[PDB]
Amino acid sequence: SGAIYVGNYRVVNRHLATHNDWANLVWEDSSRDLLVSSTTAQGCDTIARCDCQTGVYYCSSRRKHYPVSFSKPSLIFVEASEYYPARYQSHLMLAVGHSEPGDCGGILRCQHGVVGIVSTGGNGLVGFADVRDLLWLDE
Ligand SMILES: NC(=O)[C@H]1CCC(=O)N(Cc2cccc3cc[nH]c23)C1
Numbered sequence: 001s002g003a004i005y006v007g008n009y010r011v012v013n014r015h016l017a018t019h020n021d022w023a024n025l026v027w028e029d030s031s032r033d034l035l036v037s038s039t040t041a042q043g044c045d046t047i048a049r050c051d052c053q054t055g056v057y058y059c060s061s062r063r064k065h066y067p068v069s070f071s072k073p074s075l076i077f078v079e080a081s082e083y084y085p086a087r088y089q090s091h092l093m094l095a096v097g098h099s100e101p102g103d104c105g106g107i108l109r110c111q112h113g114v115v116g117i118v119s120t121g122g123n124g125l126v127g128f129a130d131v132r133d134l135l136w137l138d139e
């Protein structure tokens with residue numbers, strides 16, 4: 001689990017969104033595994049606007065942060081799960097690192113701020129849903 005809080009927005013994994021996230025829906029994209037809902041309180045997370053390929057992520061299944069090199073956002077094939085059939089997920093970045101399904105929502109950060117959230121994994125890989133192109137989150 002885990003979310004990003006920026007201004008009047010809350011970003012979560014679309015497969016983990018709540019009834020309240022859906023009742024206050026701003027934008028959702030199944031192909032990206034992302035959902036943004038509105039909040040009354042003002043968020044203080046800083047979103048990165050960059051093309052960094054190094055950063056640090058939080059892995060709840062180890063209670064640790066890990067430094068990683070990751071690929072640029074791309075269309076990657078993601079095996080089936082209880083939430084989606086087998087499909088290509090867009091705007092996904094991969095790195096060699098530990099992850100388990102319960103790690104979804106753990107934040108990836110570079111020196112400029114929040115890059116994305118854990119969304120996929122397996123076979124010693126971890127995938128992050130990018131958020132750096134969502135310029136509207138800041139305004
Ligand atoms: N399609 C998706 O974006 C998600 C949907 C829910 C989900 O459990 N997964 C599989 C998964 C996620 C994170 C980490 C690992 C490790 C093994 N399986 C993992 C993929």
Ligand SMILES: [Zn+2]
Binds near residue numbers: 052112113
């Ligand atoms: Zn950066």
